[PDB]
Subunit: 133 residues, 2 copies
């Protein structure tokens, strides 16, 4: 399972680091800013399930609660492939830097990667919007 | 790629066959009833892309508009697996039978398969409410 090209998508939020983590680390808030989950996220035996639509079935496993701003999760695709998403919140002066490490999956086109990245960016932008209102 | 286990999910809609197809075959109407797509579906190069969420990006290719009530679609997961969903609308008296052919992929569990069937059911139940109101 070889090292992949990556991009770290990130932006600044004008709220204290702890408060951004409190809101963002709660998986039940995830349908509010992660557009792929706008349909809903249900708790399912320690982990979480996203039900319906095109691919009817993804599972998400989150990192356990911590004091390092870490909200990493593994997404299990319907075909069984587990995709690791590093996601973290750190202090940026009085505010916060939110970052997502996007790994290029095998055989992906440049356009596939760019669509993925602009989608994650919009998800983080929506998180920023929510917190700053 | 061997023959897979299957389930045909189906229900009846008390609207003529032609107006159930005209609505359900409009991919711009899909966010209204397919939960995995609740966050939107954009036209892209004569295909559709749903972004983003956990999975970042998924492509959907539909069957061309036909006279058979066929609304088949192929879903391309971000790891590149192509998933064929047979979906068809047919006359049932003065109404309509709506059916979705669920194929069990290698590396699904019984609870994943069940949860998948469950989510398809609710998508069809939602298309039913929308059309009957």
């Amino acid at each position: 399972m070889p090292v992949m090209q990556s991009r770290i998508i990130h932006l600044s939020v004008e709220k204290p680091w702890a408060e951004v983590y409190d809101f963002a680390a709660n998986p039940g808030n995830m349908p509010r800013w992660a557009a792929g989950l706008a349909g809903g996220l249900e708790a399912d035996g320690e982990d979480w399930i996203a039900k319906g639509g095109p691919l009817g079935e993804v599972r998400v496993n989150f990192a356990p609660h911590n004091e390092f701003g870490v909200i990493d999760h593994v997404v299990t695709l319907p075909d069984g492939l587990k995709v690791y998403n590093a996601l973290r919140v750190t202090p940026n002066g009085s505010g916060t830097e939110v970052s997502f490490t996007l790994l290029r999956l095998e055989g992906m086109t440049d356009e596939d990667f760019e669509q993925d990245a602009s989608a994650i960016t919009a998800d983080l932008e929506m998180l920023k919007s929510l917190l700053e209102a």
